[model samples]
Target: QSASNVRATYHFYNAQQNGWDLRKVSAYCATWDADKPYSWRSKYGWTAFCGPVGPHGRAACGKCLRVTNTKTRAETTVRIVDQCSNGGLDLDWSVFKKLDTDGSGYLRGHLIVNYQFVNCGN
Candidate 1:
């Protein structure tokens, strides 16, 4: 087979408001890549808490995520509000507490967490 022999059709979507549909993915991009942060904060007049599931999850600021804390055995649903390389796993204060199975105000250190995109709405 040659490059010219390959044939396929793909669609690109840019709808303003759509479900959390799967578009594209990769191991290097979606999979784990670094140690995350534990800081929490709010903005404007909203509560601080949500998932920023690395690069793949931050495609937009409206995507929802379900994050689970391995150590604490707790999980919380959050929305993507912000992201930064240093702040690997950005979350709101309330969500942080919900995922804090240790029952502490915050996690003592970086803990293994699992997160995935969810359909927040239609």
Candidate 2:
């Protein structure tokens, strides 16, 4: 149980759970392009998490994580692309739908999710 190889639990909720506020916005699927730098593109089969926009949380970016939705028993692997606002975990559009068992492209407001850091491209 070392700090570098630790797995932590996390929670997820609807991007619009607290009423329709402009402050809440869904993540953009930033697909990577050949001409642009690797940082500018979003991996084809990866997802991003809402991390800290400050210096402390920048390290979380590019880290792969396994996410599971307790409500639906659905799970998937995603990568951290950007920091999240409000200091909470938020899911991207693709991941948001992946966790939804019903495949309605939305969850029921909140999700009890567990996440752990994994190797990149795993």
lDDT of 1 by residue, 32-87 (tens): 32122212211111111222333333454445556666555576665444333333
lDDT of every predicted structure (CA atoms) = 0.37, 0.45
CA deviation > 4 Å runs, candidate 1? 1-58, 104-109
**Highest TM-score among the candidates is held by which one?**
2
Q: Model 1: number of clashes?
A: 4
In candidate 1, position 89 carries an lDDT of 54
What is the Å distance of residue 38 in model 2 from its true position?
Answer: 6.1
Model 1, CA-based lDDT: 0.37
Model 2 residue 120 CA deviation in Å = 1.2
Alpha carbon deviation, residue 19, candidate 2 (Å): 30
Q: Which residue pairs in candidate 1 collide?
A: 48-92, 48-93, 49-92, 50-92
**TM-score versus the correct structure, for each prediction:** 0.48, 0.53
For all predictions, the C-alpha RMSD in Å is: 16.6, 8.9
Can you give the lDDT of residue 98 in candidate 2? 62
